[PDB]
Every structure is written in structure tokens, then in C-alpha cells.
């Protein structure tokens, strides 16, 4: 599989190509995800909480790297997103668990569109 670096500095890699319907901005999508810091510390997993995550793709409610990175996935696909801090939580960080200026690694599995 390839690593694509977009104009924003986002990087993504389709670990598994989906065979089902394509995700586009406007759709309400459902995913499983895991999130890690670059040192390999896991900060979240929806699979561990047994709770698929739904959001409006392109809705401006999730971090920029997600609204961008999830577009183009197909249902069944697993995509790895490497999100620079300016497309994540920036200088501010989050919840005392994501530090300032953190690059974030997510693996995202698309369950439904």
C-alpha cells in the first residue's frame, strides 16, 4: 500500500481497501478507531468501549485531519491517518492526555455510510 501526503500535510495509508460504498462529505458515517501518540501510547479505542463512532463527514465537528482523511474510504476499509498538530489539537492539546503540538496516529475502520 502507498502513503499519500496531501496538500494539508495530512498523511494516510489504506492498510485495507474497502469493497463497499464510498464515504463522501455530507454523509453520516460510522467507524471504529484507535488513536495513538507517536511514541506508541494508545489514548483511545472505540472498540475497547464497544461503541462505534458516528459523525457527519465534513461537518466541522471533528479534528481537521479526520474530516479530510476519512473522505474516500470505502465500507470495510482500514485507513491509517498521521495527523500533524495543526490538523489535530495544536498548541492546546486535549484532556491532559494529548500533549501540546502532538502528531496523532489513528487507525480508522469504516463500518457504514
Interactions with a second copy, residue window 66-85 (CB under 8 A): none
Nearer to ligand FK5, 2 or 98 (CB): 98
Q: Which does 22 bind (CB under 5 to 8 A by kind): Ca ion, a second copy, ligand FK5, none?
A: none
Q: What is the C-alpha to C-alpha distance for residues 62 and 69, in angstroms, rounded to an integer?
A: 11
- Catalytic residue, from 67, 83, 98, 106: name it: 106
- The answer to whether 113 is a known ligand-binding residue is yes
60-79 residues near ligand FK5, rule: CB under 6 A? 61-63, 66
What are the angstrom distances between the C-alpha of 96 and each of 8, 43, 92, 100? 26, 11, 10, 9
Number of residues located near ligand FK5, criterion CB under 6 A: 13
- Residue 44 has φ and ψ, to the nearest 5°, of -165, 155
Restricted to residues 46-65, the positions that interact with a second copy (CB under 8 A) are: 51-52, 54
- In 42-113 the beta strands, taken as DSSP E runs, fall at 42-45, 53-56, 78-83, 104-112
Amino acid at each position: 500500500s502507498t502513503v499519500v501526503t496531501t496538500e494539508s500535510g495530512l498523511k494516510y495509508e489504506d492498510l485495507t481497501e474497502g469493497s463497499g460504498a464510498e464515504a463522501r462529505a455530507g454523509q453520516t458515517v460510522s467507524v471504529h478507531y484507535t488513536g495513538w501518540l507517536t511514541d506508541g501510547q494508545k489514548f483511545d479505542s472505540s472498540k475497547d468501549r464497544n461503541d462505534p463512532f458516528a459523525f457527519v463527514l465534513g461537518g466541522g465537528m471533528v479534528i481537521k485531519g479526520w474530516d479530510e482523511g476519512v473522505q474516500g474510504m470505502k465500507v470495510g476499509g482500514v485507513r491509517r491517518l498521521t495527523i500533524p498538530p495543526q490538523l489535530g489539537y495544536g498548541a492546546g492539546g486535549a484532556g491532559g492526555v494529548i500533549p501540546p503540538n502532538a502528531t496523532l496516529v489513528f487507525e480508522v475502520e469504516l463500518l457504514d455510510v
